[PDB]
Design a protein around this ligand. Structure first.
Ligand SMILES: [Cl-]
Length: 455
């Protein structure tokens, strides 16, 4: 092993790669490998091979960074305790251009709890699902732009239960920016509904990033319902958005060599343009504001006080939470790296309402600071920027669509007013304003909306 959680995680992955190598070496057929007994033998053989084989296992781990991350959770992990008991944590630091994992946090203390919350435990991604499964895909399909309007008007699930956001049943129309900054749920619900109505191959996008979702026909899918992922895997999703839409598979083992040089295994990069560069860079701009607005996370404030120069780097991110309060997430990225973070309880009991907003945000600011102190230039000073392929459209702030004539239950009203630039990832850009100008909304909602617009 080159460069306790670290040892067991590295060992476990190396054993899996050794297993594949040995089975292939011995010419074991795909069928004879389906045998449970045979599988057990080869898994044990792989373990023994490493145990005393003198193999050279090269990992992607940056010693100084990983060590700094361990000292950080040791000294600052208590900042996560919010009064709902011992709060567990998982973090993964990933290189955006390669998918290599430079370091991670498996939990509060291995000696007290061996559960690896960075590589093994699967939890709902909650609201961090939105940029990837809903808004990102809608933008990529040319179904919406950066300033498109969405409905946050009250609405119910198919069973009559209202879609909630804390104790709020909703408000009204809002821009994608506001929807993302606050992480309102109804707009996400409508967006996914729109994708299914248009028959978009959502599964295709997610599978290209390695996500395994068993059922896509779920109303709350955009809010993380029906999805369970490890921090490592989810960090890979944000790595994709940060790396201008190009996915690079996560990995901790880069190569395994026998003592004599024979290559037992070696990571092979297989980049995939999941989202267009236009879509990815537009999302980066929206996620930059999610952090700057400080609506769902105090992160920017925390980091500014701890390391103002590092806070000036081009940070973008998204928080994750649901009405259940069982999982809090904060995904952060600079052009060079992505750091995923999850906190919660092993038995899934609820965290305090502000555990994600304050506690996890402060802890992660300390974690980010520790990483930078250990490796000064690792985060980078590069800026995320709009790809030149991005189409810019001048639209009304009220409708998120180009100015024009619209029929409002009689009479041809000339919809005009203040405008703003909206970014699109299609060819023609934003369409002319129509009566149903927003994503989602009932007939009544639109009556109320247009009443104000005209008013
Ligand atoms: Cl460790």
């Amino acid at each position: 092993i080159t460069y306790d959680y670290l040892y067991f995680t590295t060992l476990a992955e190396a054993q899996e790669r050794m297993y594949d190598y040995l089975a292939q070496r011995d010419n074991v057929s795909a069928k004879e490998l389906k045998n449970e007994a045979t599988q057990k033998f080869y898994r044990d053989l792989a373990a023994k091979e490493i145990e005393n084989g003198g193999y050279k296992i090269t990992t992607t781990i940056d010693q100084k960074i990983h060590s700094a991350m361990q000292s950080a959770v040791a000294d600052y992990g208590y900042l996560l305790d919010d009064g709902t008991g011992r709060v567990e944590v998982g973090n993964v630091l990933m290189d955006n251009q390669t998918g290599a994992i430079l370091g991670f946090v498996g939990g509060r203390n291995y000696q007290e709890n061996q559960n690896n919350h960075a590589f093994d435990t699967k939890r709902s991604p909650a609201s961090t699902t939105k940029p990837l499964l809903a808004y990102g895909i809608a933008i990529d399909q040319g179904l919406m732009g950066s300033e498109t309007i969405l409905s946050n008007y009250p609405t119910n699930f198919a069973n009559g239960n209202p879609i909630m956001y804390a104790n709020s049943k909703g408000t009204g129309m809002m821009t994608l920016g506001e929807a993302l900054n606050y992480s309102w749920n109804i707009p996400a619900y409508w967006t996914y509904r729109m994708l299914r109505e248009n028959g978009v191959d959502v599964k295709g996008y997610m599978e290209k990033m390695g996500y395994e979702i068993p059922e896509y026909g779920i109303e709350s899918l955009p809010m993380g319902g029906g999805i369970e992922v490890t921090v490592a895997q989810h960090t890979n999703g944000y790595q994709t958005l940060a790396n201008n839409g190009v996915y690079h598979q996560k990995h901790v083992i880069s190569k395994i060599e026998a003592a004599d040089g024979r290559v037992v295994y070696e990571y092979q990069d297989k980049p995939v343009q999941v989202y267009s560069k236009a879509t990815a860079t537009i999302m980066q701009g929206l996620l930059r504001e999610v952090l700057s607005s400080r609506v769902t996370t105090t992160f920017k404030s925390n980091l500014t006080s701890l390391n103002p120069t590092l806070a000036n780097a081009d940070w973008i991110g998204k928080t994750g939470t649901t009405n259940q309060d069982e999982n809090m997430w904060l995904m952060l990225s600079t052009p060079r790296l992505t750091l995923g973070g999850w906190i919660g309880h092993d038995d899934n009991h609820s965290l305090s309402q502000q555990a994600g907003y304050s506690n996890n945000s402060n802890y992660m600011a300390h974690l980010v600071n520790a990483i930078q102190q250990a490796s000064p230039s690792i985060w980078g000073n590069e800026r995320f920027a709009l790809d030149p392929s991005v189409v810019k459209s001048e639209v009304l702030k009220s409708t998120g669509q180009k100015p024009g004539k619209v029929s409002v239950e009689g009479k041809e009203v000339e919809v005009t007013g203040s405008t703003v630039t909206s970014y699109w990832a299609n060819k023609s850009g934003a369409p002319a304003t129509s009566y149903r100008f927003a994503i989602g909304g009932s007939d009544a909602d639109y009556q109320n909306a247009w009443s104000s617009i005209v008013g």
